[PDB]
Design a binder for this molecule. Structure first.
Ligand code: ADP
Length: 223
């Protein structure tokens, strides 16, 4: 079994917001959801959440990187977009995930505009770039909504530390330490937090706190 909501720490408002897509994918049959933009800084769980939504609905997850688009080879991106959406229709219900953002873009707009009631695909698109909100993916009949996912708050950081201390079998006193690790890590992303824990795992079922603390102060300069 894959990434689920259990593996996604914090992000409580965003979980409430992708619920409608979980519900739709679980039984197509209100307005028909097409999908959503996940917006925010890197390493903050956009991809993890999109994977979790597929797992929760129990459907396939089909991904395309925004960097299979940028027109370097003529026609190639359009052709990959078409294959993607044809596989998605055949494997439906399912999630199509476009990670991290115009023949290739126009083809995507065509696939989306061409999505009717019968298709049962949800498109989740992620980006670090806010001005994507102003463009063609957010026009009527395309991506329905966006969800802003920011750097984790103190409490969210507590939860992310706890999740990763437990994934790495360092559960003993993980909750004792999580509070201070959170206080020490303003402006850290979930990825930064995962890297601290793993670096400390790479140095029995309890965190080496004094080392974790060292890596937090190192990473505070440059992560
Ligand atoms: N909310 C979170 N809960 C648990 N781990 C997280 C969270 N956010 C980030 N991470 C960790 O950071 C990794 C990279 O994040 P990713 O999903 O690539 O984020 P993004 O798509 O926003 O740039 C995740 O696979 C996970 O290990």
């Amino acid at each position: 079994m894959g990434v689920s909501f259990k593996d996604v720490a914090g992000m409580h408002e965003a979980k409430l917001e992708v619920r409608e897509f979980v519900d739709y994918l679980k039984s197509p049959e209100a307005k028909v959801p097409k999908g959503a933009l996940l917006l925010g800084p890197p390493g903050c769980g956009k991809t993890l959440l999109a994977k979790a939504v597929a797992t929760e609905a129990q459907v396939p997850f089909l991904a395309m990187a925004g960097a299979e688009f940028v027109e370097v080879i003529g026609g190639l991106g359009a052709a990959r977009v078409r294959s993607l959406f044809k596989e998605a229709r055949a494997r439906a219900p399912c999630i199509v995930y476009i990670d991290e953002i115009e023949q290739t873009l126009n083809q995507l707009l065509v696939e989306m505009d061409g999505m009717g009631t019968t298709d049962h695909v949800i498109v989740l698109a992620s980006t670090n770039r806010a001005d994507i909100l102003d463009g063609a993916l957010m026009r009527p009949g395309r991506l329905d909504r966006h969800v802003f996912i920011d750097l984790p708050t103190l409490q969210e950081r507590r939860e992310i530390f706890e999740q990763h201390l437990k994934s790495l079998k360092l559960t003993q006193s993980s909750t004792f330490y999580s509070q201070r690790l959170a206080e020490l890590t303003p402006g850290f992303s979930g990825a930064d937090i995962a890297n601290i824990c793993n670096e400390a795992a790479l140095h029995v079922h309890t965190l080496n706190f004094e080392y974790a603390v060292e890596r937090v102060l190192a990473g505070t300069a440059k992560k």
